[PDB]
Write a protein that binds this DNA or RNA. Structure first.
Ligand SMILES: [Zn+2]
Ligand SMILES: [Zn+2]
Lengths: 74, 134, 117, 121, 50, 67
RNA sequence: AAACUUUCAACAACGGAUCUCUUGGUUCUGGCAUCGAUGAAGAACGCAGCGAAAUGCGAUAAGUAAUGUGAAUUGCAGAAUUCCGUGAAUCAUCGAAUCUUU
RNA sequence: UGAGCCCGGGUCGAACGGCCUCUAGUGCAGAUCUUGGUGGUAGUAGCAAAU
RNA sequence: GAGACCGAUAGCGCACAAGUAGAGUGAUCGAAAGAUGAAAAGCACUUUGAAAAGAGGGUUAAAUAGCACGUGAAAUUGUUGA
RNA sequence: CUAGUAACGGCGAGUGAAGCGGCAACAGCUCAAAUUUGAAAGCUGGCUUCGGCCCGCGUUGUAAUUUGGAGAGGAUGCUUUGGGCGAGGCUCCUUCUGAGUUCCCUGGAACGGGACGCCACAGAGGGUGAGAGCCCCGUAUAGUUGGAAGCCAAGCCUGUGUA
C-alpha cells in the first residue's frame, strides 16, 4: 500500500516509501499545520481530544495555585 | 427587578440550570412548605423535603391525601408518597410522582442536622424581625 | 478610497460607553489608592508654539528647575508632593517664570502637607 | 470488607501492609471463584477494590509525609515532592529577587518617599 | 392660568399654590416629537450580524 | 387649543378611536353623544360639550362640560 | 350491457409543509491572565453486572484521599451499606495522591 | 374593482389580533434555479454493478 | 451579562451519535437527523397466526396522541357515491 | 480634527503623511568612559548542629560613588533616616432573612374567571399537571455565619555605626 499507520496522529497517511506522514509529518518535531486550511487546523486543535492535564489548570488558578491542606484535615 | 450584575434573567440559562442541576442543588430546589402549626412552632416557612416526612397533598387529582414520603426522586424532580399509587395494565401498583411544591409537610423527620437547619432559619427570620421592629 | 481590503479593517465603537465606564472606574481606583491626594499632578502654564496659537496658553509637562527654586520648592521634594518637573523646558523670558512661580505659590498656599510619621 | 478511612489513618506501616495483603488475597480468590454464579459477589468485589484504593492512598500519604519530614532543612527536594504550579510560574523571579533594589534607589526612597498631602478647595 | 394648586398626602388641597412655569406654555409640535422620538428610540440598539 | 388637540387626536393617535374598513370611524369614549369620530362629536377636542347617559338605575342624565 | 378514461364529494393513505415550542446558534459588552522535559496539545489501549453511544478515569481505573452539605442512587438487578451519623450521594468543593502505551 | 378581509361547519390544543408610529433577511410561475417529496413511462425494458 | 438577531431547508458544517457516519492512496472532503403524554399510566388479558401484522378488550381528558407517536398542507394513491 | 492638505505620480488610474491645536494616560531611570587603593569593601556553589566555615569567580575589574539641562572633591551649617511583630480593615467565596395554596365556578390538572386579603429597597427570571409577587427556587436591601490568599495598617518592641 501507499500509506501506512502513523504513530503520532493514528491515521493511515504515513508514506510507506518516504517514511513521512502526510497528515502531521511524524519524523519532524513540529506537527504539520497550514493557514490555507482552517478546517484542517480545527480537526486537530487543542480541544478536540481528551485534555488530561490542560483541563485541570483553571481550577488550580482559581484558588491561587496553592499547596498544603485545610486546617483540621485528617 | 434584578440589580446585581451576576444574576441573569435569561430564560435559556435558567432552564438549562434547572434541568441540568446537581443532586445537592436539586435537593435545595425540591423544597416543600411547612404546615401552619409547624410554621408557628419552628418559625420556619419551608424546608427541603426528605424521605421520612409525613405530608399532605394540596394540589392535583390526589388532593387531601396524606402519607409518608418513601422516595425522593431528584432525577425526575418528584416525591413518592405512601399509598398514593396507581395501577399498570398488568396490575402492578406503581407510585405516582408528585412535585414537592404540591405538598405540605405535616410532620418532620427530626434529626440533629434538621434541627440545625430549623435553628438557622429561625435565627435569620427573628433577626430580620428585630431589624424591622427597630 | 476602497481599493484595498477594507472589510478586514473596519473598527466599530460599540464599546464607547463601556470604555467610558472603565475610564471612570480607573479614576475611582486612583482615588481609592491616593485617598486625600488629587488624582492629577500640578502642571505649568505654557504658551502654544506657533504664530497661529501664540495668543492662547495651555498646560505644560512639568515645572522648570528655576521656577521651582524661585518658588521655594526643592527639586527632590517636588515630585513627592504632587508637582510635575520637566528638566527639558527652559524659561527664556521673565514672563513665563513669573506666571509659573505665581502658580506654584498659589499651589503652596492651598496645600495640607502631612508629616512622615 | 469495607474499611473506613480514619481507622486506616490510625494504624502504622506494617499493619496497613497486612490489611493490604489480606485484601489482595481475598480479591484474588473472589475473582477466581466469581466466574460461576456471580450474585452478591459483585458488590463485594467493588467494595474490595475501593478498600485496596483506600489502603494504598493511606500508605502513600504516610510515606510522602515521612519523606517531607526528612527533607525539611535540605536544599534540594525530589521532583515528586516539589510544588507543581505551572512551568512559567516555576521559572519566574522569586519574591526576594524581584523586590531587590540598588543602593542608590534605596537611599533616594529612604530620604525622599512619596508624601501624604491634600489640596483644599 | 397662572397658578396650580398643591395637594396633600390625603389627596385634599393644602391651600398652597405654585406658579406654572413657562415650559407649559411651549408650542405643542407632534412632528418634532415624532422626529426626535424616532431618532432616540434607536439609540439603545445592539448590533446583529451573521 | 381645541384645534391643536383636535389635530393631535385626529391625525396622529387617539385611544378612543375604532377604525373600521367600512367607511366610518367610531369613538369608544363613553361621553361621546354619537359614537363617531368626527370634529363636532369629539368629547376631548371640544371644550364645551354635552351628552346624555343612562344610569344602571334607569335614570337618564344630561352631562355638561365647560372650559 | 360490462370494462376503461375524466371531474366532484366523504373516508382512508403517501409525504412532512404550516402553526406553536427550544438545555442551540449568532452578534455585542464587561472582569480576568492560567499549557509543556515536575512531560503539554494530540493519538492508542483498557476500567461498569447488564455498555450499545457519549462522558468520566488509569492496574488505587464511571475512580482513592481531604473539606462541605446532610439522607440518597435509580432503567432493571443487588447490598445485613448508611439515618441523633467522622455520614448516603451518577452530590458539590478541592489544597493530598494514583496516573498503562505513545 | 382588486391585491385581500370578515363570519359559519369540522379538526385542533397555547397562544394571538386590530389601530397609530418604528423597523426589515418583507410578497415568486419560470432562472437547463436549490433542497425535499411524489408521478406517466411501467409492473415496461430486462434477470446485468448494488440489492 | 446581554440583544428591535435566527428559529430546525433558518441560525455555526454540527440544537440530536458531528468534524460523527460516510468518500478518497493521500493532502483533504463531509452529511442527514429536534417535538407521545401532565404523568409510561408505553396497551394486561382472551383470540387469529410466524407479521416492524390483526380483532375484541384495557390506560388516558383524548389512542383518528400507541415510542411509524403535537398539528398534519399540496403533489400523488385506494375504497364508496354521482 | 489636521486632511484627501503637503508631497509624489503612463501628473491618468491615483497614491498619500506630519508639526501645531483639543483629549485619554502620564514616571522616570541604569550603565561605559575615574584609583577603594589607608586595605575586592563584591558574588556563585558545597558542608552544616543553621551560627559560620571551606573551595571557587574575579584585578584583562566584582561592590560603593557618578550619568552632561549633570556630576565630583573639599569646606560649611542646617535638615533627613533603619529593622521586626502586628489588632484590625479591604477584595472574594460562603450560612440565613417578605407575603394566600382562603371561598365559588370551569377544567384530567388552576398557574384561568369571580370574591375577600397580604408583601413589596423583592411585580428580574425559572419550575410547579394551563398566564403564580404571596407553592418552591431565586430576586431587592442592609446586615450576619465561617473560610482563602494577597495588600494596607492603628499601635507595640527594638535601633548606633564618629553609619
Ligand atoms: Zn502522522
Ligand atoms: Zn375621536
Amino acid at each position: 500500500k501507499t500509506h501506512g499507520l502513523c504513530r503520532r496522529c493514528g491515521r493511515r497517511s504515513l508514506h510507506n516509501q518516504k517514511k513521512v506522514c502526510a497528515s502531521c509529518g511524524y519524523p519532524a518535531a513540529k506537527t504539520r499545520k497550514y493557514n490555507w486550511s482552517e478546517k484542517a487546523k480545527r480537526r486537530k486543535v487543542t480541544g478536540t481530544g481528551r485534555m488530561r492535564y490542560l483541563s485541570t489548570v483553571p481550577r488550580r488558578f482559581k484558588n491561587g495555585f496553592r499547596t498544603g491542606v485545610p486546617k483540621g484535615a485528617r | 427587578m434584578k440589580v446585581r450584575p451576576t444574576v441573569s434573567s435569561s430564560r435559556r440559562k435558567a432552564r438549562k440550570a434547572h434541568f441540568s442541576a446537581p443532586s445537592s442543588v436539586r435537593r435545595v430546589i425540591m423544597s416543600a412548605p411547612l404546615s401552619k402549626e409547624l410554621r408557628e412552632k419552628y418559625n420556619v416557612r419551608s424546608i427541603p423535603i426528605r424521605k421520612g416526612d409525613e405530608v399532605q397533598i394540596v394540589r392535583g387529582a390526589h388532593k387531601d391525601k396524606e402519607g409518608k414520603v418513601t422516595s425522593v426522586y431528584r432525577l425526575k424532580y418528584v416525591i413518592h408518597v405512601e399509598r398514593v399509587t396507581r395501577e399498570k395494565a398488568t396490575g402492578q401498583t406503581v407510585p405516582i410522582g408528585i412535585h414537592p411544591s404540591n405538598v405540605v409537610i405535616t410532620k418532620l423527620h427530626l434529626d440533629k442536622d434538621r434541627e440545625n437547619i430549623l435553628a438557622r432559619i429561625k435565627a435569620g427570620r427573628e433577626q430580620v424581625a428585630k431589624a424591622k421592629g427597630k | 478610497h476602497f481599493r484595498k481590503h477594507w472589510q478586514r479593517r473596519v473598527r466599530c465603537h460599540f464599546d464607547q460607553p463601556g470604555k467610558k465606564v472603565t475610564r471612570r472606574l480607573a479614576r475611582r481606583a486612583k482615588a481609592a489608592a491616593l485617598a486625600p491626594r488629587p488624582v492629577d499632578k500640578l502642571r505649568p502654564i505654557v504658551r502654544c508654539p506657533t504664530v497661529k496659537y501664540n495668543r492662547r496658553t495651555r498646560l505644560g509637562r512639568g515645572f522648570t528647575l528655576e521656577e521651582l527654586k524661585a518658588a521655594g520648592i526643592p527639586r527632590l521634594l517636588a515630585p513627592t508632593i504632587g508637582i510635575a518637573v520637566d528638566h527639558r523646558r527652559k524659561n527664556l523670558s521673565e514672563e513665563s517664570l513669573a506666571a509659573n512661580v505665581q502658580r506654584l505659590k498659589d499651589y503652596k498656599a492651598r496645600l495640607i502637607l502631612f508629616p512622615r510619621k | 470488607g469495607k474499611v473506613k478511612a480514619g481507622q486506616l489513618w490510625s494504624k502504622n506501616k506494617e499493619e496497613l501492609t497486612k490489611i493490604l495483603g489480606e485484601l489482595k488475597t481475598e480479591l484474588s480468590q473472589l475473582r477466581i471463584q466469581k466466574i460461576s454464579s456471580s450474585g452478591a459477589k459483585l458488590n463485594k468485589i467493588h467494595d474490595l477494590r475501593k478498600s485496596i484504593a483506600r489502603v494504598l492512598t493511606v500508605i502513600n500519604a504516610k510515606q510522602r509525609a515521612q519523606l517531607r519530614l526528612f527533607y525539611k532543612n535540605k536544599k534540594y527536594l525530589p521532583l515528586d515532592l516539589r510544588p507543581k504550579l505551572t512551568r512559567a510560574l516555576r521559572r519566574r523571579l522569586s519574591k526576594e529577587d524581584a523586590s531587590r533594589v540598588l543602593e542608590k534607589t534605596k537611599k533616594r526612597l529612604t530620604h525622599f518617599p512619596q508624601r501624604k498631602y491634600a489640596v483644599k478647595a | 392660568r397662572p397658578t396650580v394648586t398643591v395637594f396633600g398626602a390625603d389627596g385634599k388641597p393644602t391651600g398652597a399654590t405654585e406658579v406654572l412655569p413657562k415650559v407649559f406654555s411651549a408650542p405643542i409640535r407632534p412632528d418634532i416629537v415624532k422626529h426626535v422620538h424616532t431618532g432616540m428610540a434607536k439609540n439603545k440598539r445592539q448590533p446583529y450580524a451573521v | 387649543s381645541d384645534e391643536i388637540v383636535w389635530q393631535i387626536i385626529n391625525q396622529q393617535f387617539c385611544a378612543f378611536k375604532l377604525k373600521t374598513t367600512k367607511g366610518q370611524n367610531f369613538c369608544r369614549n363613553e361621553y361621546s353623544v354619537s359614537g363617531l369620530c368626527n370634529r363636532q362629536s369629539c368629547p376631548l377636542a371640544n371644550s364645551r360639550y354635552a351628552t346624555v347617559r343612562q344610569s344602571p338605575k334607569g335614570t337618564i342624565y344630561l352631562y355638561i362640560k365647560t372650559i
